[PDB]
């Protein structure tokens, strides 16, 4: 019966862990935004080599 | 002198400095600290850029007894003008905990130095304030019109923080907390709603107790505070305005769009049901094959 | 061996005392030319001979204590000279392992004075030898004493010694250690949290008190300071010795942690808990950990594995033999990061330990 | 967890300063290739461990990391006008019958 | 006072001028630098966007390439001469 | 046998850190210099309590830019204020380079080594920092002799340490000539953290301020219209989509830049806000009147 208490504790724990990764998601968003910003330098895109490069 | 002192911005570095100075002189628990505050002035925004501890002795037997080493403030200033000319004498900080009538005298000595009005920045280093532990006050000279002589006083100027770009990127990087209020998600602003009420309730109490003190402790009638309170009762929202009826239609719009957006999220969750479910059906097949494939080798 | 210098030499010297462990009549004798008062080749050897003496004589070392005790009491004060600093570092470690479980209030007292001296590196050593001597009593004199001196000390090595030394005396004291445990986590200081995770471990060891896990899990998630994160995960292995079969489950989730620190503590938790006879689950957890890019995760990983799979017949589980040859592959590669290599060589030594 | 990882990875790639593009002019036996790095002058530079003198072909366009000029990937990829004309042009429509008379 | 001017000047630091090549937004403006390369720089909320106009000279910090304020438009002697002539 | 030759973990206080970003970054392109004031304890713990800028010089950083005349003068002012503490080293800024010492900055280091043997030389690169705290490193001399007779291993005895790795030319030059690097760590109090974030009363005052209702209307209108457009695209997504190979599906039905997902995001943000908007308005109206 104490072993089955531990399964309730693990369940509880991971709601907190997934919740955490929500916050984190947002905070990571901030970082990306700072790059987008000034100062910038204007270029000419040529061709792709790659979907992400 | 100068009357342009409409805004006060405060580098966080200043704040950090004020506690540092307090502890290096070994002043504590109703021992006071006076330092110079340096920065820009003859400009609307007073920009407090820096602060530096000065020689100061505090006497408790006579509160109007203190030491300041006048020569030293001149000397130090000379050095820092060489480092950066934009820094100039702009007044003096006090560590609090509170403002005094001795700080009026003290003001006067800094007034001589200063070609602006000396800014008195009350940094409570202890930070007992729920919000801002920093008040900014500017010595003004005005006839207090009541049948009383010209009065010299410290009138509150709201102050805000500000950070230089160069400091700020580093401030943000140091910090990583989830915050009491960040204006983030629903649950975060929701906490702020509970906080904001309890804010107001304490805040209104302060008013009630002043009104007692006028007729029980004979605090000087300040016709000015009481004038502002008249404007509160006078401009007060009331019900049975056609404005209630307008808010009442608005309520209905705000829930109705919410309701429909709730319904739309139902469709998205129902979509994922199908997709994961289709995968399971296929998983049954791949599982059966495993058993089938084992038979063929045997 | 001759290629060694500085503190690597002191390590060499203490290692001899692990080989020469037992053979107690000659316990003193193998280490006997090396002992100070009979040696003067190098100071690292003189310090490192004392350290190696207490490791031979660990546990029951009553006769041996009295030899050490002269050096401790003599050198109690003054240690700013660097020859004495090394001497005393290595001495304080000896004396603490020999008077283990002896409740020597005299030894405790001695190292107490060494603690107050703020002997540079021997102060950490002293802090450690105190809890070792008085292990498991929870003596109130010790608790307040260690507690008060940790915040006063601003030397971080001393701060560390004390944090761990607090945990040791509160070994296997259950709720009677709860009063302290409360205090260590509320201290915001990182040093103190690091030692706090393992206080919880020792006190609630052998009992899967439900309440204990709930605290470790809550600290791990809520404390962003990184060494603390790692500690609390390691700490789970000891509390949950009783049924160690629930441990692979918890830390599975924490093996998939983005954070590097968290993942390291997974490896260690498994290693400790399951160090007895093999459990298959643990191997599978530890396999992404072995080739994890983080240098210390790989290191941790390879060590953990060996504790689990502690000497077993090669045939019996064919898997054991191959994990051994992976260790070898790592060392063969001279393009493998030094750290990854440090763990590997040790790990093969545990597999074939003794 | 993976999404938090993903956004982070995107962040770390972008950092990279430099990053160019040469062409293998010829190959030598010294674990090197002479590259005319196109925006720059010439550089004779050693191979990265990932792609070697064996694999390389003369006149193949290549990617390079930073100011190091270590090999990244080989690029098949070539800018040519014929290719550029095709993109304007797209998939040629249409059935024979319509033309038919 | 004159020797103080030098020490002050070294602390003021040389400024880079561009000129408004092309408004893009209130918050981001395209400038082409006098020294050379085209940039997208930002505008402070201290300087109203109505002042900023196409072909007006502007001054920007080097550090961050952001417009601090307006400058009066470059003095061109040519169009002064043209006006003068007649008398 | 001999000396450890150990290199201190350089414990940089937050106050000192903030003056370094401010003075250096602002002062670009012109280099700035200054001393570090601190206390040295243990053989590995140096606490750098304060820094200052010594008066600018047109020789920028050189052996002679720095001076005892400047050193003494400034000290004497802080001496009175009782905030005086021993010189534990020197900093200067390289705004055009990464973290490494010029041939000149080694010579400069060498005079401060003679002063105090725990003297650090710290190269601050602030413009090509995008987080502030990164690409600043602290260094200490190693002798020419030390390289020959192999005293580099001793310094890092029994510690994981950090040896820096950015800049390949300039780094390997520094690593095998200019100086030995070890880890650099930032520490601060929990009294100060409270100050760095700053608590305000206007955090909560802004929560009972009710912004105008023209702005609520606009948000209602806008968010709904937007999702009408990606809802056509969503119909297209699920028209078939059940034939093999997942990759094939994502290009054909444009499940790249996922339209289902974008519908959810726009929906959630507006849903969350419209609930805040009702919640504040209800609180305001009863509470005031």
Curated annotation (Swiss-Prot), chain B:
Pfam families: JAB, MitMem_reg. Residues 8-143 form the MPN domain. The keyword Transmembrane does not apply. The modification N-acetylserine is found at residue 2. InterPro entries: EIF3F/CSN6-like_C, JAMM/MPN+_dom, MPN, MPN_RPN7_8. One of its GO terms (cellular component) is proteasome regulatory particle, lid subcomplex. Keywords: Acetylation, Phosphoprotein, Proteasome. One of its GO terms (biological process) is proteasome-mediated ubiquitin-dependent protein catabolic process. One of its GO terms (molecular function) is metallopeptidase activity. It comes from the Eukaryota. N-acetylated by NAT1. The keyword Glycoprotein does not apply. Present with 19800 molecules/cell in log phase SD medium. Acts as a regulatory subunit of the 26S proteasome which is involved in the ATP-dependent degradation of ubiquitinated proteins. PANTHER family: 26S PROTEASOME NON-ATPASE REGULATORY SUBUNIT 7, EUKARYOTIC TRANSLATION INITIATION FACTOR 3 SUBUNIT F-RELATED. Belongs to the peptidase M67A family. This is 26S proteasome regulatory subunit RPN8. It comes from Saccharomyces cerevisiae (strain ATCC 204508 / S288c).
UniProtKB/Swiss-Prot annotation, chain C:
It comes from the Eukaryota. It comes from Saccharomyces cerevisiae (strain ATCC 204508 / S288c) (Baker's yeast). N-acetylated by NAT1. This is 26S proteasome regulatory subunit RPN2. PC repeats lie at residues 11-44, 48-85, 90-124, 125-159, 161-194, 195-230, 231-263, 265-299, 300-337. Acts as a regulatory subunit of the 26S proteasome which is involved in the ATP-dependent degradation of ubiquitinated proteins. The chain holds residues 356 to 709 of 945 of the full protein. Interacts with UBR1. Belongs to the proteasome subunit S1 family. Present with 4750 molecules/cell in log phase SD medium. Signal peptide: none annotated.
From Swiss-Prot, chain E:
N-acetylated by NAT1. The 26S proteasome is involved in the ATP-dependent degradation of ubiquitinated proteins. The regulatory (or ATPase) complex confers ATP dependency and substrate specificity to the 26S complex. Belongs to the AAA ATPase family. This is 26S proteasome subunit RPT4.
Curated annotation (Swiss-Prot), chain F:
InterPro entries: JAMM/MPN+_dom (IPR000555), JAMM_MPN+_peptidase_M67A (IPR050242), MPN (IPR037518), RPN11_C (IPR056263). Pfam families: JAB (PF01398), RPN11_C (PF23594). The gene is RPN11. The JAMM motif is required for the deubiquitination and degradation of ubiquitinated substrates. One of its GO terms (cellular component) is proteasome storage granule. Belongs to the peptidase M67A family. CDD domains: MPN_RPN11_CSN5. This is Ubiquitin carboxyl-terminal hydrolase RPN11. One of its GO terms (biological process) is proteasome assembly.
């Amino acid at each position: 019966e104490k072993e089955y208490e531990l399964l309730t504790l693990q369940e509880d724990y991971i709601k907190d862990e997934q919740r955490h990764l929500k916050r984190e998601l947002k905070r990571a968003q901030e970082e990306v935004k700072r790059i987008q910003s000034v100062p910038l330098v204007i270029g000419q895109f040529l061709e792709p080599i790659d979907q992400n490069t | 002198m100068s009357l342009q002192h409409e805004k006060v911005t405060i580098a966080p570095l200043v704040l950090l400095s004020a506690l540092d100075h307090y502890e290096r002189t070994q002043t504590k628990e109703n021992k006071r600290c006076v330092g110079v505050i340096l920065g820009d002035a003859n400009s609307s925004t007073i920009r407090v850029t820096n602060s530096f501890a000065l020689p100061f002795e505090e006497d408790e037997k006579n509160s109007d007894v203190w030491f300041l080493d006048h020569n030293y403030i001149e000397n130090m200033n000379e050095m820092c003008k060489k480092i950066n000319a934009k820094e100039k004498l702009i007044g003096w900080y006090h560590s609090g905990p509170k403002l005094r009538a001795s700080d009026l005298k003290i003001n006067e000595l800094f007034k001589k130095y200063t070609q602006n009005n000396p800014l008195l920045l009350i940094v409570d280093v202890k930070q007992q304030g729920v919000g801002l532990p920093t008040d900014a006050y500017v010595a003004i000279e005005q006839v207090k019109d009541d049948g009383t002589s010209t009065e010299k006083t410290f009138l509150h100027l709201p102050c805000t923080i500000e950070a230089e770009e160069a400091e700020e990127i580093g401030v943000e990087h140091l910090l990583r907390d989830v915050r009491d209020q960040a204006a983030g998600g629903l649950s975060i602003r929701l906490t702020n709603q509970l906080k904001s009420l309890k804010g107001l309730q304490s805040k209104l109490k302060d008013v009630v107790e002043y009104l007692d003190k006028v007729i029980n402790k004979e605090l000087p009638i300040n016709h000015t505070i009481l004038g502002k309170l008249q404007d509160v009762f006078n401009l007060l929202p009331n019900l049975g305005t056609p404005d209630d009826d307008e808010i009442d239609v608005e309520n209905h719009d705000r829930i109705n769009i919410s309701n429909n957006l709730q319904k739309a999220l139902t469709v998205k969750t129902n979509d994922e049901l199908m997709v994961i479910y289709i995968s399971n059906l296929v998983r049954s097949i791949i599982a059966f094959d495993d058993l089938i494939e084992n038979k063929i080798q045997n | 061996l001759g290629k060694a210098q500085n503190w690597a030499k002191f390590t060499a010297t203490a290692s001899l005392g692990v080989i020469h462990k037992g053979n107690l009549l000659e316990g003193k004798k193998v280490m006997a030319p090396y002992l100070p008062g009979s040696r003067a080749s190098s100071r690292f050897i003189k310090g490192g001979s004392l350290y190696g003496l207490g490791l031979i004589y660990a546990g029951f070392g009553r006769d041996t204590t009295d030899y050490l005790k002269n050096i401790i009491v003599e050198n109690s004060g003054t240690s700013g000279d660097e020859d004495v600093d090394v001497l005393l570092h290595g001495a304080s470690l000896g004396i603490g392992l020999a008077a283990m479980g002896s409740a020597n209030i005299e030894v405790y007292e001695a190292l107490k004075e060494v603690l107050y001296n703020d002997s540079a590196t021997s102060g950490e050593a002293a802090a450690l030898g105190m809890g070792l001597c008085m292990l498991g009593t929870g003596k109130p004199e010790a608790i307040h004493d260690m507690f008060t001196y940790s915040q006063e000390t601003q030397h971080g090595n001393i701060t560390r010694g004390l944090a761990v030394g607090l945990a040791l005396i509160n070994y296997g004291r259950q709720e009677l250690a709860d009063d302290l445990i409360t205090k260590m986590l509320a201290s915001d200081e990182s040093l103190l949290r690091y030692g706090g995770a393992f206080t919880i471990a020792l006190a609630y060891a052998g009992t899967g008190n439900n309440s204990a896990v709930k605290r470790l899990l809550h600290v791990a998630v809520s404390d962003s300071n990184d060494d603390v994160r790692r500690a609390a995960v390691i700490a789970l292995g000891f509390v949950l010795l009783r049924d160690y079969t629930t441990v692979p489950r918890i830390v599975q989730l924490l093996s998939k942690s983005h954070n590097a620190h968290v993942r390291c503590g997974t490896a260690f938790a498994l290693g400790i808990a399951c160090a007895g006879k093999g459990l298959q689950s643990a191997i599978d957890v530890l396999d992404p950990l072995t080739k994890d890019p983080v240098d210390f995760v790989r290191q941790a990983a390879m060590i953990a594995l060996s504790m689990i799979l502690i000497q077993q017949t090669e045939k019996l589980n064919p898997q054991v033999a191959d994990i051994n040859k992976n260790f070898l592959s790592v060392i063969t590669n001279k393009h493998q990061e030094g750290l990854a290599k440090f763990g590997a060589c040790v790990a093969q030594g545990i597999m074939n330990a003794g | 967890n993976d999404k938090v990882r993903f956004i982070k990875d995107e962040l770390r790639l972008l950092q990279e300063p430099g990053s160019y593009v040469g062409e293998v002019i010829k190959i030598v036996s010294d674990k090197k290739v002479l590259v005319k790095v196109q925006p720059e002058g010439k550089y004779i530079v050693d191979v990265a461990k990932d792609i070697n003198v064996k694999d390389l072909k003369a006149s193949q366009r290549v990617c390079l990391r930073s100011d190091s000029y270590m090999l990244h990937k080989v690029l098949e990829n070539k800018a040519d006008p014929l290719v550029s004309l095709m993109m304007v042009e797209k998939v040629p429509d249409s059935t024979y019958d319509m033309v038919g008379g | 006072d004159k020797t103080e001017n030098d020490i002050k000047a070294l602390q003021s630091i040389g400024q880079l001028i561009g000129e408004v090549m092309k408004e893009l937004s209130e918050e981001k403006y395209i400038v082409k630098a006098s020294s050379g390369p085209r940039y997208i720089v930002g505008v402070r909320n201290s300087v109203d966007r109505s002042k900023l106009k196409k072909g007006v000279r502007v001054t920007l910090d080097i550090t961050t390439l952001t417009i601090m304020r307006i400058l009066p438009r470059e003095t061109d002697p040519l169009v002064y001469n043209m006006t003068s002539f007649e008398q | 046998t001999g000396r450890d030759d150990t290199k201190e973990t350089v414990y940089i206080s937050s106050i000192a850190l903030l003056k370094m970003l401010k003075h250096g970054r602002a002062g670009v392109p012109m280099e700035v210099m200054g001393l570090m004031l601190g206390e040295f304890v243990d053989d590995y713990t140096v606490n750098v309590v304060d820094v200052f800028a010594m008066p600018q010089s047109g020789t920028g950083v050189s052996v002679e830019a720095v001076d005892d005349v400047f050193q003494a003068k400034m000290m004497d002012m802080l001496k009175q204020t009782g905030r005086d503490q021993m010189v534990v080293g020197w900093y200067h800024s390289h705004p055009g380079f990464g973290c490494w010492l010029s041939s000149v900055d080694v010579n400069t280091q060498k005079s401060f080594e003679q002063l105090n043997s725990r003297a650090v030389a710290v190269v601050v690169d602030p413009i090509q920092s995008v987080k502030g705290k990164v690409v600043i490193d602290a260094f200490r001399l190693i002798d020419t002799g030390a390289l020959i007779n192999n005293l580099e291993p001793r310094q890092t005895t029994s510690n994981t340490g950090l040896l820096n790795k950015a800049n390949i030319q300039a780094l390997i030059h520094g690593l095998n000539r200019h100086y030995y690097s070890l880890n650099i760590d930032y520490h601060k109090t929990a009294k100060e953290t409270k100050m760095l974030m700053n608590l305000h009363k206007e955090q909560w005052q802004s929560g009972l301020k009710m912004y105008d209702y023209e702005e609520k209307e606009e948000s209602n209108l806008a968010a709904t219209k937007s999702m009408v457009k990606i809802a056509e695209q969503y119909s297209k997504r699920i028209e078939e989509e059940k034939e093999l190979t997942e990759e094939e599906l994502k290009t054909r039905y444009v499940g790249r830049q996922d339209p289902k997902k974008h519908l959810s995001e726009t929906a959630d943000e507006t849903l969350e806000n419209n609930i805040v908007s009702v919640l504040t308005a209800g609180v305001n109206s009863v509470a005031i009147k």
